[PDB]
Amino acid sequence: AFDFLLLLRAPYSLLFRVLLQCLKQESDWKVLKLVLGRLPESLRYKVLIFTSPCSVDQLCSALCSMLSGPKTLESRTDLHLAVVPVLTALISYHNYLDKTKQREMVYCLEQGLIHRCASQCVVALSICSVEMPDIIIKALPVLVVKLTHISATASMAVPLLEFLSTLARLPHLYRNFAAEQYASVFAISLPYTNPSKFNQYIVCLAHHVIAMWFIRCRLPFRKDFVPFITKGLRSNVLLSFDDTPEKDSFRARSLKNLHLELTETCLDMMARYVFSNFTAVPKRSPVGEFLLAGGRTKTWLVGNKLVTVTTSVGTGTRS
Amino acid sequence: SQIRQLQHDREEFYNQSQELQTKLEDCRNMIAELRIELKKANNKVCHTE
Amino acid sequence: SQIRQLQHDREEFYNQSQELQTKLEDCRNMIAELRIELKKANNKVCHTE
Amino acid sequence: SFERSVQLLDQIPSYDTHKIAVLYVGEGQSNSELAILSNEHGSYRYTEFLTGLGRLIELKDCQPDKVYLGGLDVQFTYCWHDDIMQAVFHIATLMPDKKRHLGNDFVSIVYNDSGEDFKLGTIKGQFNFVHVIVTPLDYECNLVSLQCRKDMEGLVDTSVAKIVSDRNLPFVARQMALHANMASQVHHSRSNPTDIYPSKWIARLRHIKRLRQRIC
Secondary structure, three states, X not given: OHHHHOOOOOOOOHHHXXXXXXXXXXXXXXXXXXXXXXXXXXXXXXXXXXXXXXXXXXXXHHHHHOXXXXXXXXOHHHHHHHHHHHHHHHOOOOOOOOHHHHHHHHHHHHHHHOOOOOHHHXXXXXXXXXXXXXXXXXXXXXXXXXXXXXXXXXXXXXXXXXXXXXXXXXXXXXXXXXXXXXXXXXHHHHHHHOOOOOOHHHXXXXXXXXXHHHHHOOOOOOOOHHHHXXXXXXXXXXXXXXXXXXXXXXXXXXXXXXXXXXXXXXXXXXXXXXXXXXXXXXXXXXXHHHHHOOOEEEEEXXXXXXXXXXXXXXXXXXX | OHHHHHHHHHHHHHHHHHHHHHXXXXXXXXXXXXXXXXXXXXXXXXXXX | OHHHHHHHHHHHHHHHHHHHHXXXXXXXXXXXXXXXXXXXXXXXXXXXX | OHHHHHHHHHHOOOOEOOEOOEEEOOOOOOOOOOOOOOOOOOOHHHHHHHHHHOEOOOOOOOOOOOOOOOOOOOOXXXXXXXXXXXXXXXXXXXXXXXXXXXHHOOOEEEEOOOOOOOOHHXXXXXXXXXXXXXXXXXXXXXXXXXXXXXXXXXXXXXXXXEEEOHHHHHHHHHHHHHHHHHHHHHHHHHOOOOOOOOOHHHHHHHHHXXXXXXXX
């Protein structure tokens, strides 16, 4: 029955209460998982709800209703890991989904973080954020606080960074914050920078998101994390090699070779963007060119930096 | 066989009528895009000013 | 005799369908380059603006 | 010698590059090699998505060399700038060549507009590793998914579909696309071709260390 009735592409809203009922009581057999697999495509084709006058809310509630409770086990891990996809697909309708119910389902996802897994949950969180960020606005802080405790899982390694990045590209959402948010973000990111454990893809992505958040990070309270950051960095080079892994954090003054290059580039970017932001492209005003055109020049390499000096000879004047 | 193919060709002419009327609607939307093109031509003249 | 009748009806349906699809053909062939020229001119106006 | 090292070393921008490619499919154009790169025209939703992708761009000469070979000759060559990621789009409608350019990119965009499914077999390509299929729907909400080249799905998950409304599909689309491009560059580099590392910063740092080694 379920198989056939879920294929309507031209008599409606009856099957709606039918579904409501069959999910309401828990048949406690594979038929449960069977209808749960019948759901997601019905959500792909959750298109005829143009007829159903927003009764989906109740099933959504029913969803969260059967999210927790022994009345489900009257497979529970699979129960969660399959109901999370269906509410995931459900999240599309930001409008008809009740506002307080959206708050509720956000809390459901928040509790689905601490779980057997939440990869699906966290990517759905990214989606709901881009979709109904107004709702996430309140959950964001405690969300990240709990996220502090995922403990360097190579499994969720990718989706976390993905979500952090996506969020960062949404400034107006986090338009206001405070230090602890960014501090927690960096603490979460840092361990994912292992030179051996995680992926080179994961490594480079981690450095990218670190950099871009640190950019999006407020100019005030920007230097704060800098030692912690390089601490978080030097604490990722703990035992990979320690030739010259010294602190060198400028708070005082103010193969594993790839790992060294990583540390180099990251702290250099920070130094470049600490204390202010500035595009990395110079273009001299015409006056400069006129003055030093063809000027006598000289370039040196003090260290990994490339210094260049040029001197005018009054070309334009004699012109 | 003959009656079955008659029904076949019936549904064929039917979907043909469907695509024909929807094609007339598409040409309607085409001339609507043309009217928007003339709106952009009003924009052309103010632009050349 | 039933065979004759059904065959004649199918042939007439065939004539109808062929002429309808030629109509569809010509109108689609005009519509394509119509919208092409429209969008070309309009986006060029956008560029100039 | 060191002078020309300084020229080439200076070249590589501190702004990470992103050559991306956009496609379009139609009913007749479904599962077609000579009909996918043929049409210089797409759908209405396709066009509004395209103009929503990035902001206006022109390929004039007064602008610096910050544009790549794709979009050098013929036409809006839509792009999107940011702190370190530059994104050239290579619209399938803006080559008038196109096969030589669209195929070369590691990742591409494919707007599933016909109504049937889709596979990589549509175009042989050059390194078109991962695809991202996006399909419309009755209302504004539209579906998005991604496909591997059966070789790197371990690196990039594939069972990732999602619904997204109009004013949010371009952003999330380009986002996951950039993720895929990252994956592809990491894969190529993982093949150890001693080529430009994706992290252009560490790239030019290697450049400088190479200068150092050259002197001593």
